[PDB]
């Protein structure tokens, strides 16, 4: 599997984020994060570099080449969906970065390095950066960098933007509300979508969860993991025991068999913002964020940089867009209680997006 490091990192990141946010809706693009952090890693040296390699799961020496190849695959023209990943480097106009870093970053990340005036016009630069991301995401991520995130000490902002719009291979019927069980003391009504279709469905006994694949048109699918636990979300077991080995066997090998499935899932939309320094530090990436210990001499031979924060913003809008059967003997997948979901690029086996839906 040519995306294994990114998937290992995605699951560990999810777990660490789940300590910060144990029960509420969560949604992120681990692909986006990995690509941003690979650009930052290119610039790192010494212990900073060593820690980043461990954390990003590169140790589990042609890392940048892999990113370019994965990125080409994800960006490959299809008529089946819109899917775009783009990297961008914004640099202080008066700073002098290593020519080899600027060259190699463009070569492997296509980040089109661009000068901006953090030193004297940090707020305008913040705005320019946000506006760039806004465009790349078709308006969906309008203000990536919050107020106060960039200042006269900022020297570089490394950015990835990812955009996906697809239709289901088979449309859902909008049921024209069902109680969604939020926790043992709360049910909330949600708009359900229904589909009866030939679909891959299985059960992961180690995680006590059903798994369902809902394909988009083209080689992207959403996988849903639905526990069948606790008095809270019902996800504790799944979230703590999920691993690469456990998941990959079911998403990417052929443990799932096709059957006629009656599927009920909510129509939902999430928008989540994270600041990942604390999470990343907790994962083992300490020196990068340590103003006195960081080594980014790959980016500048003056060795006068550190990573102050990693801002992530992600959103998803899930809806219906894509006779005479009355038996109900076979499989049901009724997502009326919390579940994990991920959007998988099937060719690369990369996880593009990963989330927990728990609260309508």
């Amino acid at each position: 599997d040519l995306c294994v490091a990114n998937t290992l990192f995605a699951l560990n990141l999810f777990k660490h984020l789940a300590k910060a946010s144990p029960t509420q809706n969560l949604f992120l693009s681990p692909w986006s994060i990995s690509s941003t952090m690979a650009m930052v890693y290119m610039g790192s040296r010494g212990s900073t570099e060593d820690q980043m390699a461990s954390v990003l799961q590169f140790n589990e020496d042609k890392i940048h080449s892999s990113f370019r190849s994965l990125s080409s695959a994800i960006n490959a023209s299809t008529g089946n969906y819109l899917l775009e990943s783009v990297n961008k480097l914004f640099g202080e106009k008066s700073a002098s970065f290593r020519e080899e870093y600027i060259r190699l970053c463009q070569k492997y990340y296509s980040s089109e390095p661009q000068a901006v005036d953090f030193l004297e016009c940090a707020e305008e630069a913040r705005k320019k950066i946000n506006s760039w991301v806004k465009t790349q995401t078709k308006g969906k991520i309008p203000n990536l960098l919050p107020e106060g995130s960039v200042d006269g000490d900022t020297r570089m902002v490394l950015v990835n933007a990812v955009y996906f719009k697809g239709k289901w291979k088979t449309p859902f019927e909008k049921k024209l509300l069902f109680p969604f069980r939020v926790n043992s003391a709360q049910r909330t009504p949600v708009q359900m979508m229904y589909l009866r279709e030939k679909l891959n469905i299985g059960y992961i006994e180690d995680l006590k969860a059903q798994i369902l694949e809902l394909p988009y048109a083209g080689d992207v699918s959403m996988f849903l993991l639905l526990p069948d636990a606790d008095v809270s979300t019902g996800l504790e077991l799944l979230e703590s025991e999920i691993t690469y080995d456990k998941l990959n066997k079911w998403t990417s090998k052929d443990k799932m068999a096709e059957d006629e499935v009656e599927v009920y899932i909510p129509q939902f939309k999430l928008e989540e913002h994270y600041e990942l320094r604390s999470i990343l530090r907790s994962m083992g990436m300490e020196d990068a964020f340590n103003k006195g210990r960081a080594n980014f001499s790959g980016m500048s031979e003056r060795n006068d940089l550190f990573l102050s924060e990693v801002f992530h913003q992600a959103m998803v809008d899930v809806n219906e867009e894509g006779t005479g059967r009355t038996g109900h003997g076979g499989p049901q997948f009724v997502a009326d209680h919390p579940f994990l979901f991920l959007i998988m690029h099937k060719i690369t086996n990369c996880i593009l997006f990963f989330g927990r839906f728990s609260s309508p």
Partner: peptide
């Protein structure tokens, strides 16, 4: 499904 994300790493001078 429409989905999107931005990620920004901020490098600061010391």
């Amino acid at each position: 499904t429409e989905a999107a994300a931005g990620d920004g790493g901020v490098m600061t001078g010391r």
